[PDB]
């Protein structure tokens, strides 16, 4: 899709193998934010939004928090506290055609700067600065969209760069998306490191005597300590009390 009305997929309820991406040499920029590139396969994510657009080559630096520019303000704005990773690679031989390519267009004039993650399909003509324009482009009201016109003879800064941005928040369970890991058997009554669906901690696990409501993925005691969790494999409720410690 073009940079206006960028395609968004809501990736959820699957195991995500990130190892095929961050070790793949096909990508030009793999600048992640708020997460290490090599730790992506070892984490569980609440919801993963995958965006996709094609932009001009010199404009790939604008897709980053806090930047400014036409793409950054009128087409696609990342928030100031963005977490995720931005993936881009050159696509001059797939997105550009001989004599030109015109399926890719970008918004050039807008009355106001976009909110983060906003999407503006509105092709209504630009503000006049004068008497308003009924429906006709000209002299005050311009067409807000504009095609790059990608050509194979253009420089690397003008070549069509195909960009994918993965936006995803990393709270605890219920994590719909997590990386690949061999789930193993349950070890009760021992001081055991656990990774329950993204909920990570160290403690002993006891068969719980408390009754969860059928929606609660885990529980907490007073002062926000995670006292209980339900098993993602067999739906048993397990109490987590800390491993025994004390001064000697």
């Amino acid at each position, epitope marked *: 899709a073009s940079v206006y009305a960028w395609n968004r997929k809501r990736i959820s309820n699957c195991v995500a193998d990130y190892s095929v991406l961050y070790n793949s040499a096909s990508f030009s920029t793999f600048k992640c934010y708020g997460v290490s590139p090599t730790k992506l396969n070892d984490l569980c994510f609440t919801n993963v939004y995958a965006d996709s657009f094609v932009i001009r080559g010199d404009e790939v630096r604008q897709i980053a928090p806090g930047q400014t520019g036409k793409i950054a303000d009128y087409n696609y704005k990342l928030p100031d506290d963005f977490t995720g990773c931005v993936i881009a690679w050159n696509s001059n031989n797939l997105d550009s055609k001989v004599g*030109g390519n015109y399926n890719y267009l970008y918004r050039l004039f807008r009355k106001s700067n976009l909110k983060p993650f906003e999407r503006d399909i509105s092709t209504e003509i630009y503000q006049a600065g004068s008497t308003p324009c009924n429906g006709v*482009e*000209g002299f005050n009201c311009y*067409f807000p969209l*504009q*095609s790059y*016109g990608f050509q194979p003879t253009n420089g690397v800064g003008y070549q069509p760069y195909r960009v994918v941005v993965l936006s995803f928040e990393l709270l605890h369970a219920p994590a719909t998306v997590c990386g690949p890991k061999k789930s193993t058997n349950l070890v009760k009554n021992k001081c055991v490191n656990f990774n329950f669906n993204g909920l990570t901690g160290t403690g002993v696990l006891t068969e719980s005597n408390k009754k969860f409501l059928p929606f609660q993925q885990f529980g907490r005691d007073i002062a926000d300590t995670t006292d209980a969790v339900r098993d993602p494999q067999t739906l048993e409720i397990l109490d987590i009390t800390p491993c025994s410690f004390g001064g000697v």
Partner: antibody
């Protein structure tokens, strides 16, 4: 090289139709608007209308609205101007022109084609 | 249409002018006055795109500026290169653009 290649000349019967084509080259076809202006062989120069290759929005002058239409062809990087009834007042050389401005519809005509001559017969 | 004087005269190395009698009610209000230099038999080119601004490649010896309702383009130190028709144009208030009649530069 930003010269626009206009089509060849044509001769048409009175009252009949005719279409003229100007092919872009060098510059980015989408963007820069394309205005159509006519010059009678005796005198003067008159403006008909423009189509933008960016969006295909058209405007026309009042003297030609409802009797002459325009269209674009981004596949061949060319824009067409169509005349429905070749009246004997319209036997003239028709010129296509770019605009200086990037993507706004102003009127700053820089580079002009060689011009396809049109003739009304008898 | 635009009223316009038909001709101007001179000799190579002199200074002469050509004027454009537009109406201040409709023509001069939205200014944007563009002048074009047209030899016979060939396409013209813009010679002052705004009311006073030359395009790239235009010699500096050509000058112009609106003055009240009328607009004028002047040629200083001309030669055989400047024997051409000259046309006035403007916005005319809405998308219906208008041109002038077209004065003719002449050198004795």
């Amino acid at each position: 090289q930003v010269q626009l290649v206009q089509s060849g000349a044509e001769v048409k019967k009175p009252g009949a139709s005719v279409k003229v084509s100007c092919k872009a080259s060098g510059y980015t076809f989408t963007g820069y608007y394309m205005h159509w202006v006519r010059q009678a062989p005796g005198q003067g120069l008159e403006w008909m209308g423009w189509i933008n290759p960016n969006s295909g929005g058209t405007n026309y002058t009042q003297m030609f609205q409802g009797r002459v239409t325009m269209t674009r062809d981004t596949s061949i990087s060319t824009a067409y101007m169509e005349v429905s009834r070749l009246r004997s007042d319209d036997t003239a050389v028709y010129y296509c022109a770019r605009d200086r401005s990037w993507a706004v519809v102003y009127y700053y005509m820089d580079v002009w084609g060689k011009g396809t001559t049109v003739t009304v017969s008898s | 249409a635009l009223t316009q004087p038909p001709s101007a005269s001179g000799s190579p190395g002199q200074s002469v002018t050509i004027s454009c009698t537009g109406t201040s009610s409709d023509v001069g209000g939205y200014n944007y006055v563009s002048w074009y230099q047209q030899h016979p038999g060939k396409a013209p080119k813009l010679m002052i795109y705004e009311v006073s601004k030359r395009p790239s490649g235009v010699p500096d010896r050509f000058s112009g500026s609106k003055s009240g309702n009328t607009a004028s383009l002047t040629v200083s130190g001309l030669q055989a290169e400047d024997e051409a028709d000259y046309y006035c144009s403007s916005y005319a208030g809405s998308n219906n653009l208008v041109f002038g009649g077209g004065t003719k530069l002449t050198v004795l």
